[model samples]
Target chain A: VQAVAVLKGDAGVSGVVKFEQASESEPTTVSYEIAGNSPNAERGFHIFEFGDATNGCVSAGPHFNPFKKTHGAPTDEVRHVGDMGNVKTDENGVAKGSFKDSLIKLIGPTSVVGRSVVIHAGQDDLGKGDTEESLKTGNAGPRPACGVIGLTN
Target chain B: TNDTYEATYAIPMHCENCVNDIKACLKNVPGINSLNFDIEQQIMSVESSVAPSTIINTLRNCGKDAIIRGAGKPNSSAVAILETFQKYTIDQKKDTAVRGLARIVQVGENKTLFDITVNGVPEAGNYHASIHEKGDVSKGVESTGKVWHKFDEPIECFNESDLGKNLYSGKTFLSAPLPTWQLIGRSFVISKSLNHPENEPSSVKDYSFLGVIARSAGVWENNKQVCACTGKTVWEERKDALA
Candidate 1:
């Protein structure tokens, strides 16, 4: 199964994220091509709980945590299913990369389709920082861009 | 304090009997304050506390297809695209999940209008429509979460003979105390059963569908004739939507 999210923000943040899963047991491949970030920055990226962008990123809700787990790195055993960590941008504010994730699914109950993908203004501390916000959101600053994942052919 | 609101719909009418039949059919439906038919324009203006879907269904019972021309005023409208997510068979390579569309507009202090249409349903029967708290559709209707609001009446689907064998369609014009803004980012669901989606067991046969509510242009807010992305004119896109 395959899905895609077309991310957008009020401040000119826009890009696309494509997700593909070869089978139910296989890890989902997440590939992203994004632009309009701060130069040479590590922006927090995650799948939020809701796809509602009615009020911009606020309505998208917190990180998706169907397992009722606290926030952590994507590889952490206790991390929320949406904790994808960060995407680093180049000098011209562009980020592109691909990774395979075992937690995120495209066809199951925890599938990220119809949820929101968000790019934050600050880097994700990966649940390692001292503050409480680090565990919940990695102290990621304001959301700069987000898009709802949709079914794609 | 009157809680009624006004809405207009575009329905085909060939003669006076068509209008009279509609009037007679809706005469018993409670919450309807008034009905004004514009035969020349082939539209009907309704003042009622009843949901728009109920009115449309009532009309459909008498063989009339109704489409909303405009509801409420500008900037108070929203839309959702309902789709199916059942496991696809090998023969079905293309994405054909879309099954319905809903338009919402706030018409009064506590009244909103819903023009919901579901086409190409697998069966002809009663389907429940509701707004869920979450917009997630990753697992189709299974992940939409708890119900926030349920329509007063069930959507009655019928055979659309022209649309081909075994294919069914349903339409409803429902009025509720919901505000358009509050519904955004939420999911609108149409289910085969009245039971809550979250409580249902996951199965491949489940036929519920859902879509996220999003802000839409008011009547005058969208006047562009062509889409920049597809380069298709408004009429062309309308044809595509119909097909």
Candidate 2:
């Protein structure tokens, strides 16, 4: 199944987050189309544990990690399922990209549905930094826009 | 070989409409040869050759609040079941011009049903009722602006018991049920009567907001006496006597 992302809160960011079912050759496809960021600016993005919009972006909670793994980039062997790396805006403040990974399973126990996606004010270090917060939230700053991941197709 | 089996589940049903919604979703699954649903018992029996998980998944897709109760042969019958619900009362806030009694029920995790009446409200007017995040019975509606959630449906005089012509009732269900533990601390607020005939008002000027502290959905037929300090109405205390 696939889903759409309805961005919330300020920062003037909006996007569509899609999750394609796993295929025999590929694990799954996770894509995003974020519009309205500062030109040439990079932002941290990840799936959150909760989809509740009661408190705006802050209510989405921490990164989604059903396996309880440490924070790292999507390429890392051991990392949170929410770790989708970063998306950079262009001259038009539009960031459109897609990434395929074996960790994004929308089925079974580690399913990502009914959760949330959050956009942060700062860039992610992808667990490569020596800072203590790097091993935690990749030092993702304040969440400005968020969207609940609901089932689409 | 067709190894058909029957199963029953405890799906929350607030009213007959909810029963139909559940039935509509569960009736079309593949291999579902026969199914029986009861509104009062809030139980459903299904006979299917497909895996039990398939049936459960179909129900889950419709709504997340359901659980398997028992399963047996397609021809066998399960034991009789009784249905019960908790009752919570809605009382008028002090130092407010609005006055009324409302009752809220926590039927399931996502299902809540309410019946309310307000005095000093506009005649033939519409108002909005919502569950705010805070639970201060002393604060007026505007003071309790921390609205964390809202009902999918509106609240109005349902026109059932028009004795005083001030009663209002409505039924609303949830995609996810609210547990009793999480509801006790929340407050239910009735917004100031809006001028519109049906739609809710975006703003209020006089701010005649009245509130009721959402308490436990106590049992029925308890015959408990109302204390003077309870700040509850006569019907609020006596609703437990309902059969």
Candidate 3:
């Protein structure tokens, strides 16, 4: 599935976030790709639960924490289903990265097809080396951009 | 006042349509006889017994950018002059799909009023005007700025009106102290229709028919060429003051 992201709040950024199910070779991993830019560096990224843009990015609700886990890093076993960590930008602030995840799914009860992705203005603490709010929200500052995920045949 | 006087104004008339607009506006005013303009010198000369103020007002009401520079009779004591508001022009953003000027008028000392004249909106019934959070024109009035200051009354748009066939007008006085629209960076959005329908997302297109960024009130107080934030005042890139 592919989601076209529309940047907001003078974001100066726009791009797409895509997710594909695990193939025969990588049966347990879901491949993901995000291509975008941030006017500022170190933007926190996540897969928020709702697909609503009615109130801008804020309407997407909190991070997609289906398993009631803490906001851990992408490599953590107890991380939220939406805890795909930040994508770093170069000196020019352009983010282009791809990775594989074992926790995200497209066919199960925790499928992320109808969810949304939020691009924040600040850095996420990766659930470890930060304060109390960081454990719950990754300490991601105001959400400046987001997009609704949809199925693309 | 003399029986007849002549006045000159600096108004550029380039096309037949401009001349027609001027002539048609001044067609049937009382005590006006000779009306002629010169394209070479970019001057409009008028001899009328009417007050020069009324003549200038007439020309202005006809949608001409006219300013009477000097007016007098060659041998009489009928010297004529003219004079003239905290108003701001709310321009349509990149994607609101709207045209025309939306002005916030400071009616009296503290009475706030919004007088929006817009066109290019084909569907017109009843639209509500409100203040949104951000003034970034690139955001297209939706999915960014939610309704900040909502008007208690609904603004209306007529299918037949002054600016266009589907010109929508919002000329109502807002409640309380009038300094609301004067805020440096808020947005004025006109949503199509009145009363939200149940079971529909309040999107910009569904909620607001059109929107514009509201800038500060300026030197042109009469709502003529009010603030537009045109150079993207939000960006402010005269380069950090070079300090």
Candidate 4:
């Protein structure tokens, strides 16, 4: 079984849409759960497409999509396989979201399981399927924070 | 001996995701109760109602450098004392005196440092110092009968740099000026002079600063920039440190 690799980043400076890790091996399903949410975790969850590097650094791409689909919300069964499952956000912004769909196949060839957790200081536009909303997490903004994923050595 | 079960894994992990992954995986075990962490050490401890043998194999197969200790109560001398007094050695010595290891962390790009407190063996007329990992030497600076160390030296706290905010991405991180990150050597030993009849009034020095050491996060980063961003690295380093 391809073990899941995870890493969390500091979202204190601003808030982040997703946490990050460096990279991972070929795995069937890779998933992560944030412990306590940032005061702003709701704005953090985004259904990304490929690696994000508009600023020069190579980063983990969007959610898993084993079905060969496009980006959208978890509610859309036909959306990107990378769509992280339902995020259950509680009263204080503490959330427990699970991302365990077709992780390995998305890379079809590359690896996202062992990538870093990049926390952007903005919100995910939850792809209105709006062509106007570029798939770049809706171009949600700058990398407020970034953290790589790896094994606990 | 109390039936307390604890399990530790040296896995390559950084960030909170790694901690949660391990926590979820381990805590889901039958009879497993709770799990917490030494975030700096990457040490995840699980307190369970079952034997570690139940999960040790799985962890090992997953490349987790895992170990289980303390199923039977306080056999180690140090732990024995802790089990009895609910406090560490140095803390047990005096009723009102403050003594223990102290840690200092500097804000990233901010330049100043913050003092972190560590509980350790207390000093009375005598005490023992221990040598953990790193090149730290276990030595003691005595305060026999003289005025406590504080009265002997100039006392200072909250320097300008110490009180200001931190910087993130070269930009001023004003909201929460602190880095929230700490590393080894970041902690130091702080103390003051102890009083006796010869000193008469026995000047009691408030808190004083100790020497600094690199903190866990700092050491991990200097060792490998990838240390905090990955899981495999987390397991590897934690295992080495645990060993």
Candidate 5:
């Protein structure tokens, strides 16, 4: 088992963190809960790709997928052949998220753990359809103010 | 010992002329006892016990693209191709207005497949295709950038590779069938040429930028052809419903 925080939260809070057990049989489970936030931006909707080096410093690799699932499905989309999405924030600017994935290795295998809980300069468009429903999705803009997630306790 | 076993060949086509094109082409194979075309599933089923190579060769002779997907690893010669692919690598990961087309890079031995959606692009907006060692990808029929493809060996080539040599590494390729509605029509047949020199785009013949690695075949399906590209059309034709 290995873990790291890619995005750092508010003063009292930690940054984005990830834990992977390469040998996990079932989806390696990740558990998180965010309660507060900072003036930078309240964490909320965001979009994520499988593996983007931009989210690199946090040791982020590819998007997480314990199951071979595609992106955009609910958290439990039966082992997506593709996407494993992002963390959410609240009123006080706090956010916490969790899940399991196949990206067990932090570096060699590229898992988007410990990256940025980036409050994109703007809100992340939770990609939906062309309809007003999907208006917020598509891209998670340039990193506005981000905190790197690190090793968890 | 395996008399009860029977082989099948199915040429799946999306266009109207594909049926006749496939039938007109495959009718003369030496060992292929029978052939069928399925438009709905776009699969070509061939019946034979001699060897899939004979029928595949026949299809190639007729300018048809075919895959000999079966239970075991692809024939030994194919494994040799995997060894050849060890030399494969993307020259550079270039970006373009083509959006989805830019992020893909071949990975794994034999340069079997690539996924660019991981490269800071939305999965919904990207596309990629894998070229087989024997396939051809022609230039610019579709208004997209030139394809990046390459093949280091030609099994029947007039000249052999000095790097791998006449080594006959006893390596074979891994095989699997394509998805249900991937490349409709003669495109399936056309994409056949894309296989040779899979990593070198300039080497592709009759290249159409739309040719993609179908996501629907993401993994194994029924132990036949691989469901490697399971999400090809789902992005445009359907909503991202996997969640």
Candidate 6:
């Protein structure tokens, strides 16, 4: 199955995130190309719980944390299912990359379809900060852009 | 004053009792102001502030299924579904968190009509509705940014004391200068606060529900009787939607 999210924000931020999985056992391949951020910056990127962006990114709810685990790096086994760590932007404020994730799924209960993708204002601490917020959200600042994931052929 | 508009639904009814039963089911439902039926055509026209989904759900309660045949006029209609979000908790069961729906149609150039209905409200007081500047809802109402347009009049919700529940329902008809195309891909919000002006951004704790406005089929624009992919009839799709 395949799905996509076209992200847009009021601050001229926009991008698209695509997800593809060939089978139930295979890891989902997530490819993204986002623009309009701080030059040479790193921003947090994560799948959210709801596709309902009715109120903006806030309505998308917290990261897709179905396992009831603490926040960590995408490579960590204890991290949220929605966590994809951060995206690094070029000097012109464009970020593009692709990676495979074992946690996210396009089908079944843990499916990320009909959810959302959010680009945060600051770099995710990846559960490395000393504060309590670090373990929960990596202390990523406010969200600048987000989009709902929809099904694609 | 609440502006009134009409919406038509196609329902299968064979007898007068069917009409009576449907009427009784919706009689106490707020926002449904009036109803007119053409039994031979299987069409029911309703003049109210209620959303089309609420009306369909009410009809389903009395064992009748319905689909929206026409709402407003052609090429001037849109819809938004309102829902609440829990910030940190995840509920496994797929419980319906939908609280309201808004239906929009252009009645005249520079004059658009909004039919809104909300149920399961936590309070019975003045509620405000508005259109936000952005369609991104990844963070709930807080990220919707500043208000693009605000409805001056507040929707007054009454307590359903007879139902033995604390929830409230509100319905109203509103008019604005926005066109349907301009409103599409934007977010429609209902909130308890009118304090948030157009100049100021929305707060995180505003206690709001919102949905992105999408263009709906104008009268006669949607006429598909069966689904090509699912091979289901219109009624079958209706059942799946309700479920």
Q: TM-score order of candidates, best first? A: 6, 1, 2, 3, 5, 4
TM-score of 5: 0.30
Instruction: Give Cα distance to truth, residue B179, candidate 6, Å.
Output: 1.7
Best by DockQ: 5
Model 4: per-residue lDDT, tens digit, A45-78?
4332222121112223344344666556656665
lDDT of 3 by residue, B1-243 (tens): 234545566687988688778888888888787878788766777876565446666777767777544444211111100000001122223323334334332323444434444444444566666665543333345433566677767555554655554444433323334453232234456655423344333332244433323222121111121111123453476555543
lDDT of each: 0.72, 0.53, 0.51, 0.33, 0.32, 0.72
Q: Tens digit of lDDT per residue, candidate 5, span A3-86?
A: 432332223543443455555444555545543344435333231221122212121222233444433434434322223344
lDDT of 2 by residue, B1-243 (tens): 244555666677867487777768876776677877776677677665544445666778877466554444211211100000111122223322333433333333344334344444333335555666643322234334477566555445344433344544332222224443344334455553434423423333432343323222121211111210113477766886784
Candidate 6 lDDT, tens digit per residue, B1-243? 254456778887688588887788888988777888789877788877665667887777777898775666654676677876442122124445567888787766666778788876665678889998765555667656788899988888785633327767878877788887667656889987433334234333455787766545455444434210113489888999999
DockQ of each: 0.04, 0.01, 0.01, 0.01, 0.05, 0.02
Give the least accurate 10-residue stretch of model 2 chain B, judged by summed lDDT.
B78-87
**lDDT tens digits by residue: candidate 1, B1-243:** 264656677787777588888888888999888888878867788876666678777888877888654445543666677766563332134536667878677877766778788887755678888998766565566666678898878788885834546678887777788986567656788877423335335444446777777545343332222110113489888999999
Q: Over all chains combined, what TM-score does candidate 3 have?
A: 0.41
TM-score for the first chain in candidate 2 comes to: 0.89
Give model 4's docking category: incorrect
Candidate 1 residue runs with Cα over 4 Å from true position: A1-153, B1-70, B88-95, B193-202, B229-243
Give the worst 10-residue stretch by lDDT in candidate 6 chain B: B223-232
Better of 4 and 5 by lDDT: 4
lDDT of 5 by residue, B180-232 (tens): 11111111111123334555545444322222221111111222321111225
Kindly report which residue pairs in candidate 1 clash with one another. A52-B185, B51-B173, B51-B174, B51-B175, B52-B173, B52-B174, B52-B175, B53-B172, B53-B173, B53-B174
As for lDDT, the candidate ahead, 3 or 6, is: 6
